Design an enzyme around this catalytic site. Structure first.
Site, PDB file in Angstrom:
ATOM      1  CD  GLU A  51      28.943  38.955  37.755  1.00 24.21           C
ATOM      2  OE1 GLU A  51      29.812  39.606  38.133  1.00 24.21           O
ATOM      3  OE2 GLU A  51      27.920  39.522  37.340  1.00 24.21           O
ATOM      4  CG  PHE A  94      34.584  38.225  36.683  1.00 23.74           C
ATOM      5  CD1 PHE A  94      33.162  38.722  36.589  1.00 23.74           C
ATOM      6  CD2 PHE A  94      34.989  37.176  35.641  1.00 23.74           C
ATOM      7  CE1 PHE A  94      32.187  38.265  35.775  1.00 23.74           C
ATOM      8  CE2 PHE A  94      33.760  37.101  34.800  1.00 23.74           C
ATOM      9  CZ  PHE A  94      32.659  37.334  34.781  1.00 23.74           C
ATOM     10  CG  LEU A 150      30.846  46.899  31.197  1.00 26.43           C
ATOM     11  CD1 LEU A 150      29.724  47.418  31.436  1.00 26.43           C
ATOM     12  CD2 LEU A 150      32.108  47.551  31.842  1.00 26.43           C
ATOM     13  CB  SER A 168      40.524  44.627  52.160  1.00 29.48           C
ATOM     14  OG  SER A 168      39.747  45.491  52.831  1.00 29.48           O
ATOM     15  CG  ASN A 210      39.926  46.232  57.287  1.00 29.39           C
ATOM     16  OD1 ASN A 210      39.654  47.277  57.840  1.00 29.39           O
ATOM     17  ND2 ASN A 210      41.278  45.524  57.511  1.00 29.39           N
ATOM     18  CG  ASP A 262      26.391  47.265  35.691  1.00 32.19           C
ATOM     19  OD1 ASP A 262      27.523  47.057  35.192  1.00 32.19           O
ATOM     20  OD2 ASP A 262      25.684  48.359  35.795  1.00 32.19           O
TER      21      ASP A 262
END
Ligand SMILES: *SCC1=CC(C)(C)N(O)C1(C)C
EC number: 3.2.1.17
Length: 164
Positions: free
Chosen positions: A11, A104, A32, A117, A132, A20
């Site tokens: 990040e 996150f 965010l 997945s 996947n 973003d």
């Protein structure tokens, strides 16, 4: 290495508001602020989140506080999620970190949707899981980040990060 260090890598750290890859106002270490296109609304969300008139600028300590709240929320989101929890339980430490990273970044509900997945991960079919995981908007929206996380899920090692 651990989840905090891993995410700090992915990040980065910004002391001012930026957008973003979705064009949403963000700050600090991937925090965010809001999905609203109004920068003023975003600045008020920031003041609300920090507890003072920030004029849109925070300190490193404030960024880290938001970060701790965010990793905590991501872990709690996984533990109370019927699809995510079972998989998380089955994972080793490093791979658990990759799961927390995904949550996150895109939220509990969004990650819980990676049905196939998750199945592959719970079955330790790592190669298949990796493939996947790439069948997703995520793999294309933030490619290099998704690759580090995917590679982590495959190898179960911190190699995708330690190189950096
Ligand atoms: S920036 C002014 C403001 C708006 C709202 C989100 C209602 N608040 O919490 C403050 C006082 C930050």
């Amino acid at each position: 290495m651990n989840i905090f260090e891993m995410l700090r890598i992915d990040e980065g750290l910004r002391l001012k508001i930026y957008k973003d890859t979705e064009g949403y106002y963000t700050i600090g270490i991937g925090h965010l602020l809001t999905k609203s296109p109004s920068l003023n609304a975003a600045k008020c969300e920031l003041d609300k989140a920090i507890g003072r008139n920030t004029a849109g600028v925070i300190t490193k300590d404030e960024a880290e506080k938001l970060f701790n709240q965010d990793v905590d929320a991501a872990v709690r989101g996984i533990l109370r999620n019927a699809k995510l929890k079972p998989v998380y339980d089955s994972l080793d430490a490093v791979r658990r970190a990759a799961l927390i990273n995904m949550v996150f970044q895109m939220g509990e509900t969004g990650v819980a949707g990676f049905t196939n997945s998750l199945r592959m991960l719970q079955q330790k079919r790592w190669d298949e899981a990796a493939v996947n995981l790439a069948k997703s908007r995520w793999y294309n929206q933030t490619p290099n980040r998704a690759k580090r996380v995917i590679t982590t899920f495959r190898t179960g090692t911190w190699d995708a990060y330690k190189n950096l």
